[PDB]
Amino acid sequence: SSVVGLHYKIGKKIGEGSFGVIFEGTNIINGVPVAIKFEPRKTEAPQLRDEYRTYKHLQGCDGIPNAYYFGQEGLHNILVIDLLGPSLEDLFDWCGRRFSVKTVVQVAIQMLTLVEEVHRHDLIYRDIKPDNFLIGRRGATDENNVHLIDFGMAKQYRDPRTKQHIPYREKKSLSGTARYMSINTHLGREQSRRDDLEALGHVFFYFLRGQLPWQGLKAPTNKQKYEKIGDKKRTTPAVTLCDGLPQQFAEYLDSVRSLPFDAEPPYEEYRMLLLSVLDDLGQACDGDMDWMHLNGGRGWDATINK
Ligand SMILES: [Cl-]
Structure with a gap:
């Protein structure tokens, strides 16, 4: 039926x-x-x-x-x-595997807002990746707004009534996809709000650069490959990632990498940080995104693009 x-x-x-x-x-x-x-x-x-x-x-x-x-x-x-609609990974591909600084900033603050509200409901996401952030549909009021789907790895990080953080533990099995997962996740540590944010900073550089320096790494097994990826994340300073890019993105990744385990992140402070990029470059946060110029202005096409 x-x-x-x-x-x-x-x-x-x-x-x-x-x-x-x-x-x-x-x-x-x-x-x-x-x-x-x-x-x-x-x-x-x-x-x-x-x-x-x-x-x-x-x-x-x-x-x-x-x-x-x-x-x-x-x-x-x-x-x-x-x-x-399509994921940010889909639009990334169609935009030539690179988002411009204006689009990244606008997309970032919406991702910071989404993850924040998730944290407000006592859960950490723990599966941050561009494939789980979708735009709306053609003609909809939220057509080019960022959405968040797929919550199969969401975990309660604090008691909903007492607001008390989960204990810190280690030796946990590697959770998520190695390209975006935080350094603490590579080391098998219990994740928290900070790890959802650090994974976003990795995604932001992935949009700005078109790749991450720990992509395409080789190893005999997946355990060793995840370690090599985790190794270069700690070897690569945030400023080298931010080469020829607005330093606020390196500043962001460093600040969320330094957050204590149970600390509540300053979400609005991070949003203002990324917003000041647009002021530095004389741009406005008006909503214009790269994918809204695809195909002559039409938008994204189902059989050419995908
Ligand atoms: Cl192994």
Whole structure:
């Protein structure tokens, strides 16, 4: 039968692999587009139901999609959420694998705002990467605004009522993708708010430079490869990353790398820091992004770009 969750008809597939399947969908009551996340029921990595709960806790926060339904159907588990646009990694590719300073600053402060609100709801993200930051859809009011999806690695870092930080521990298994993960994550340390921020600084340099100096490294195994990547992150000073770039980005990475384990980061201080880049270069934070000039001004095309 075409319809799951009583009201959500399944359309084209937009992703397959370990995430069971992800589909396009439409609400059969109002026609609004949704994304249908299927997950095999009896599997060794059950994660969807908690991702639905996380969306419900973060419900209403701007930039976080709504969760409309979760339940059992067949031998699959379904999460229906707002369908959104391409990831920042997609637009990165289409923009020639480089964002200009204006776009990076504007995108950064929205990522700082999203992650902040996540922290306000007592959770750390722990999977920061450009592939999990999506823009809206054509014609929508939030078309070129940054969103945050995929919360399967979100963990509670403080008690919601007492606001008391989790204990510091070590010797944990390496969590996330090695290109953006913080240095503390490489060393197997318990993550916190600071690590979500340090991973953003890595993403910011990845947008500005088009690559990171610890990409394309070789090693016999993945354990040794993750260590070589972690090794160059500590060998490479923030100023060398920021070569020919506004030093506020090096200043940002250094300041969040120095944050104590339980310290609350000065989010607005970081946003003002990156905003002062635009004042230094005589630019305005008006919302104009690089991808809004693709294809002659049209935007991004489904079969040329992707
Ligand atoms: Cl090994």
